[PDB]
Design an enzyme around this catalytic site. Structure first.
Site, PDB file in Angstrom:
ATOM      1  N   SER A 164      -4.970  -9.981   6.177  1.00 53.03           N
ATOM      2  CA  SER A 164      -6.133 -10.197   7.076  1.00 53.03           C
ATOM      3  C   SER A 164      -6.341 -11.691   7.369  1.00 53.03           C
ATOM      4  O   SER A 164      -7.125 -11.991   8.257  1.00 53.03           O
ATOM      5  CB  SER A 164      -7.358  -9.617   6.470  1.00 53.03           C
ATOM      6  OG  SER A 164      -7.512 -10.137   5.141  1.00 53.03           O
ATOM      7  N   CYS A 178       4.631 -20.338 -26.238  1.00 54.92           N
ATOM      8  CA  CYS A 178       5.878 -20.873 -25.646  1.00 54.92           C
ATOM      9  C   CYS A 178       6.983 -20.877 -26.701  1.00 54.92           C
ATOM     10  O   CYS A 178       6.647 -21.072 -27.861  1.00 54.92           O
ATOM     11  CB  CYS A 178       5.629 -22.287 -25.150  1.00 54.92           C
ATOM     12  SG  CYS A 178       6.974 -22.899 -24.120  1.00 54.92           S
ATOM     13  N   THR A 229       0.870  -1.194   0.000  1.00 54.82           N
ATOM     14  CA  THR A 229       0.000   0.000   0.000  1.00 54.82           C
ATOM     15  C   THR A 229       0.900   1.235   0.000  1.00 54.82           C
ATOM     16  O   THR A 229       0.523   2.212  -0.660  1.00 54.82           O
ATOM     17  CB  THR A 229      -1.018  -0.010   1.141  1.00 54.82           C
ATOM     18  OG1 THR A 229      -0.336  -0.327   2.345  1.00 54.82           O
ATOM     19  CG2 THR A 229      -2.148  -0.988   0.931  1.00 54.82           C
ATOM     20  N   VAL A 285       3.762  -1.710   8.289  1.00 52.71           N
ATOM     21  CA  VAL A 285       4.801  -2.778   8.169  1.00 52.71           C
ATOM     22  C   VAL A 285       6.152  -2.125   7.856  1.00 52.71           C
ATOM     23  O   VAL A 285       7.185  -2.540   8.421  1.00 52.71           O
ATOM     24  CB  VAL A 285       4.390  -3.868   7.159  1.00 52.71           C
ATOM     25  CG1 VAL A 285       3.265  -4.697   7.742  1.00 52.71           C
ATOM     26  CG2 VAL A 285       3.988  -3.327   5.794  1.00 52.71           C
ATOM     27  N   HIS A 306      -1.533 -16.806  -5.176  1.00 55.02           N
ATOM     28  CA  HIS A 306      -2.646 -16.319  -6.027  1.00 55.02           C
ATOM     29  C   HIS A 306      -2.105 -15.944  -7.399  1.00 55.02           C
ATOM     30  O   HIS A 306      -2.891 -15.427  -8.181  1.00 55.02           O
ATOM     31  CB  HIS A 306      -3.421 -15.195  -5.323  1.00 55.02           C
ATOM     32  CG  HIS A 306      -3.913 -15.620  -3.979  1.00 55.02           C
ATOM     33  ND1 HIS A 306      -4.307 -14.720  -3.000  1.00 55.02           N
ATOM     34  CD2 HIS A 306      -4.038 -16.855  -3.436  1.00 55.02           C
ATOM     35  CE1 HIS A 306      -4.683 -15.392  -1.929  1.00 55.02           C
ATOM     36  NE2 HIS A 306      -4.483 -16.700  -2.155  1.00 55.02           N
ATOM     37  N   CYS A 309       7.797 -26.234 -28.884  1.00 51.69           N
ATOM     38  CA  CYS A 309       6.611 -26.336 -27.993  1.00 51.69           C
ATOM     39  C   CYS A 309       5.481 -25.503 -28.574  1.00 51.69           C
ATOM     40  O   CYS A 309       4.395 -26.064 -28.784  1.00 51.69           O
ATOM     41  CB  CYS A 309       6.912 -25.819 -26.600  1.00 51.69           C
ATOM     42  SG  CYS A 309       5.649 -26.305 -25.402  1.00 51.69           S
ATOM     43  N   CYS A 349       3.222 -21.702 -19.895  1.00 51.04           N
ATOM     44  CA  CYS A 349       2.838 -22.566 -21.032  1.00 51.04           C
ATOM     45  C   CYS A 349       1.985 -23.717 -20.520  1.00 51.04           C
ATOM     46  O   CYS A 349       2.400 -24.378 -19.568  1.00 51.04           O
ATOM     47  CB  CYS A 349       4.087 -23.145 -21.674  1.00 51.04           C
ATOM     48  SG  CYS A 349       3.757 -24.373 -22.955  1.00 51.04           S
ATOM     49  N   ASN A 401      -0.167  -6.252  11.308  1.00 47.20           N
ATOM     50  CA  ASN A 401      -1.378  -5.857  10.550  1.00 47.20           C
ATOM     51  C   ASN A 401      -2.056  -4.707  11.273  1.00 47.20           C
ATOM     52  O   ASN A 401      -2.163  -4.807  12.481  1.00 47.20           O
ATOM     53  CB  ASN A 401      -2.368  -7.015  10.410  1.00 47.20           C
ATOM     54  CG  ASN A 401      -3.160  -6.920   9.132  1.00 47.20           C
ATOM     55  OD1 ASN A 401      -2.612  -6.989   8.034  1.00 47.20           O
ATOM     56  ND2 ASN A 401      -4.463  -6.711   9.253  1.00 47.20           N
ATOM     57  N   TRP A 411     -12.445  -4.440  -2.331  1.00 48.69           N
ATOM     58  CA  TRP A 411     -13.739  -4.979  -1.852  1.00 48.69           C
ATOM     59  C   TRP A 411     -14.402  -3.989  -0.883  1.00 48.69           C
ATOM     60  O   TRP A 411     -15.624  -3.847  -0.939  1.00 48.69           O
ATOM     61  CB  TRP A 411     -13.582  -6.360  -1.209  1.00 48.69           C
ATOM     62  CG  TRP A 411     -12.822  -7.393  -1.989  1.00 48.69           C
ATOM     63  CD1 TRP A 411     -12.134  -8.434  -1.437  1.00 48.69           C
ATOM     64  CD2 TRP A 411     -12.725  -7.573  -3.419  1.00 48.69           C
ATOM     65  NE1 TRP A 411     -11.579  -9.218  -2.411  1.00 48.69           N
ATOM     66  CE2 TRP A 411     -11.925  -8.722  -3.637  1.00 48.69           C
ATOM     67  CE3 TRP A 411     -13.220  -6.889  -4.540  1.00 48.69           C
ATOM     68  CZ2 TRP A 411     -11.587  -9.176  -4.915  1.00 48.69           C
ATOM     69  CZ3 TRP A 411     -12.888  -7.332  -5.804  1.00 48.69           C
ATOM     70  CH2 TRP A 411     -12.084  -8.465  -5.988  1.00 48.69           C
TER      71      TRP A 411
HETATM   72  N1  LIG Z   1       1.045  -0.253   5.455  1.00 47.85           N
HETATM   73  C1  LIG Z   1       0.377  -1.211   6.099  1.00 47.85           C
HETATM   74  N2  LIG Z   1       0.956  -1.763   7.181  1.00 47.85           N
HETATM   75  C2  LIG Z   1       0.345  -2.771   7.804  1.00 47.85           C
HETATM   76  N3  LIG Z   1      -0.809  -3.356   7.521  1.00 47.85           N
HETATM   77  C3  LIG Z   1      -1.363  -2.791   6.441  1.00 47.85           C
HETATM   78  C4  LIG Z   1      -0.861  -1.749   5.699  1.00 47.85           C
HETATM   79  N4  LIG Z   1      -1.736  -1.454   4.664  1.00 47.85           N
HETATM   80  C5  LIG Z   1      -2.721  -2.304   4.806  1.00 47.85           C
HETATM   81  N5  LIG Z   1      -2.570  -3.115   5.890  1.00 47.85           N
HETATM   82  C6  LIG Z   1      -3.435  -4.227   6.329  1.00 47.85           C
HETATM   83  O1  LIG Z   1      -3.155  -5.330   5.498  1.00 47.85           O
HETATM   84  C7  LIG Z   1      -4.296  -6.229   5.439  1.00 47.85           C
HETATM   85  C8  LIG Z   1      -4.440  -6.763   4.036  1.00 47.85           C
HETATM   86  O2  LIG Z   1      -5.514  -7.749   3.993  1.00 47.85           O
HETATM   87  P1  LIG Z   1      -6.466  -7.832   2.714  1.00 47.85           P
HETATM   88  O3  LIG Z   1      -6.783  -6.450   2.224  1.00 47.85           O
HETATM   89  O4  LIG Z   1      -7.538  -8.835   2.923  1.00 47.85           O
HETATM   90  O5  LIG Z   1      -5.439  -8.518   1.678  1.00 47.85           O
HETATM   91  P2  LIG Z   1      -4.945 -10.063   1.623  1.00 47.85           P
HETATM   92  O6  LIG Z   1      -3.562 -10.102   1.050  1.00 47.85           O
HETATM   93  O7  LIG Z   1      -5.153 -10.650   2.984  1.00 47.85           O
HETATM   94  O8  LIG Z   1      -6.009 -10.638   0.606  1.00 47.85           O
HETATM   95  C9  LIG Z   1      -5.833 -12.023   0.277  1.00 47.85           C
HETATM   96  C10 LIG Z   1      -6.470 -12.268  -1.061  1.00 47.85           C
HETATM   97  O9  LIG Z   1      -7.875 -11.942  -0.986  1.00 47.85           O
HETATM   98  C11 LIG Z   1      -8.262 -11.238  -2.185  1.00 47.85           C
HETATM   99  O10 LIG Z   1      -9.496 -11.676  -2.599  1.00 47.85           O
HETATM  100  C12 LIG Z   1      -7.130 -11.531  -3.177  1.00 47.85           C
HETATM  101  O11 LIG Z   1      -7.230 -12.829  -3.718  1.00 47.85           O
HETATM  102  C13 LIG Z   1      -5.914 -11.474  -2.241  1.00 47.85           C
HETATM  103  O12 LIG Z   1      -4.731 -12.147  -2.675  1.00 47.85           O
HETATM  104  C14 LIG Z   1      -5.484  -5.420   5.986  1.00 47.85           C
HETATM  105  O13 LIG Z   1      -5.859  -6.052   7.200  1.00 47.85           O
HETATM  106  C15 LIG Z   1      -4.936  -3.990   6.199  1.00 47.85           C
HETATM  107  O14 LIG Z   1      -5.361  -3.360   7.393  1.00 47.85           O
HETATM  108 ZN   LIG Z   2       5.913 -24.894 -23.588  1.00 48.14          ZN
END
Ligand SMILES: Nc1ncnc2c1ncn2[C@@H]1O[C@H](COP(=O)(O)OP(=O)(O)OC[C@H]2O[C@H](O)[C@H](O)[C@@H]2O)[C@@H](O)[C@H]1O
Ligand SMILES: [Zn+2]
Ligand SMILES: O=C1CC[C@@H](C(=O)O)N1
Length: 282
Positions: A200, A157, A48, A242, A124, A161, A132, A224, A62
């Site tokens: 999360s 590819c 972020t 972070v 993900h 291939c 490929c 978090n 979301w």
């Molecule tokens: N600078 C920061 N420092 C610390 N925490 C932070 C910061 N910025 C945001 N946060 C926290 O970071 C957290 C991010 O959680 P989420 O947003 O669910 O992301 P995921 O990686 O878990 O989503 C997983 C999958 O779901 C999706 O559908 C896709 O498939 C994704 O790959 C939050 O709690 C923020 O408060």
């Molecule tokens: Zn290939």
């Protein structure tokens, strides 16, 4: 897409006050020092500070979608620079204090940071990686692969291939890559310290991996801004940015956060670099 459960979005942020934060980052320090096998689990929160919005934070994709608003990006995926956090994980791998890195991020930054792919599970997938359908050869590109949901890109590819090249971005229904999940699981089981950064922990089975370390007596550290599914199973929860946490930690560890030379791909982890002698702990 509509039927998709997007879990709990927009939960309040927690901020540990400064002195609780300084103490918790020293305890995390102590746990890195105390641990033989350290696995990091990353989610959208570590990106972020690069201008890429997360999914479930206050301004998550979301989250805003639920309130009829749009996520905002302050960068393209191509012009996004790895964070201090990204570059702390590179240096921790290089000095042998990170055994494995598990990421749910598709933003491509771990790889672009120079982080070795043979120590990374991208659960993900990756916007820059096409694969490929035949030889399973992965191409790490300089621009995002223009498809999501494991579709044909247009390119073929080129291994000595002509196989159809597809994106690695999982759709809601698509099960995780078996190799990546298998290696992420094994690393998570064998770890004595699993540390989560900016996830999360709400997606099965990605969010559950850090719990496996807890089995066998492993310690769990969650970093978090918001609560997370498994906060209760954590030996340490740090509520702060972070970047700030990882800069204090590296500083306690005697480590520099290296320069990012621009987009670079490292297939295999090079031999480990000297690190500082460990403090006397007990
Ligand atoms: N600078 C920061 N420092 C610390 N925490 C932070 C910061 N910025 C945001 N946060 C926290 O970071 C957290 C991010 O959680 P989420 O947003 O669910 O992301 P995921 O990686 O878990 O989503 C997983 C999958 O779901 C999706 O559908 C896709 O498939 C994704 O790959 C939050 O709690 C923020 O408060
Ligand atoms: Zn290939
Ligand atoms: O395609 C997207 C939307 C959100 C962004 C991310 O990695 O957070 N990826």
């Amino acid at each position: 897409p509509f039927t998709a459960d997007k879990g709990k979005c927009g939960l309040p942020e927690i901020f540990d006050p400064p002195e609780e934060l300084e103490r918790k980052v020293w305890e995390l320090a102590r746990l890195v020092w105390q641990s033989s096998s350290v696995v990091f689990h990353t989610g959208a929160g570590i990106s972020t500070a690069s201008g890429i919005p997360d999914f479930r934070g206050p301004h998550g994709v979301w989250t805003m979608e639920e309130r009829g608003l749009a996520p905002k990006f302050d960068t393209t995926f191509e012009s996004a620079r790895p964070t201090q956090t990204h570059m702390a994980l590179v240096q921790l791998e290089r000095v042998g204090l990170l055994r494995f890195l598990v990421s749910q991020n598709v933003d491509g930054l771990h790889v672009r940071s120079g982080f070795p792919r043979d120590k990374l599970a991208e659960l993900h997938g990756n916007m820059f990686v096409e694969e490929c359908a035949k030889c399973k050869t992965q191409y790490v590109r300089d621009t995002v692969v223009g498809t999501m949901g494991l579709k044909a890109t247009g390119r073929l590819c080129t291994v000595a291939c002509r196989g159809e090249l597809r994106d690695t971005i999982l759709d809601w229904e698509d099960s995780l890559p078996d190799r990546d999940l298998a290696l992420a699981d094994e690393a998570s089981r064998n770890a004595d310290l699993s540390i989560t950064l900016g996830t999360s922990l709400q997606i099965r089975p990605s969010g559950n991996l850090p719990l496996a370390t807890k089995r066998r007596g492993g310690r769990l550290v969650i970093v978090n801004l918001q609560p997370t599914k498994h906060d209760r199973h954590a030996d340490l929860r740090i509520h702060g940015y972070v970047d700030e946490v990882m800069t204090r930690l590296m500083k306690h560890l005697g480590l520099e956060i290296p320069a990012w030379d621009g987009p670079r791909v490292l297939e295999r982890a090079l031999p480990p670099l000297p690190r500082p002698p460990t403090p006397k702990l007990e």
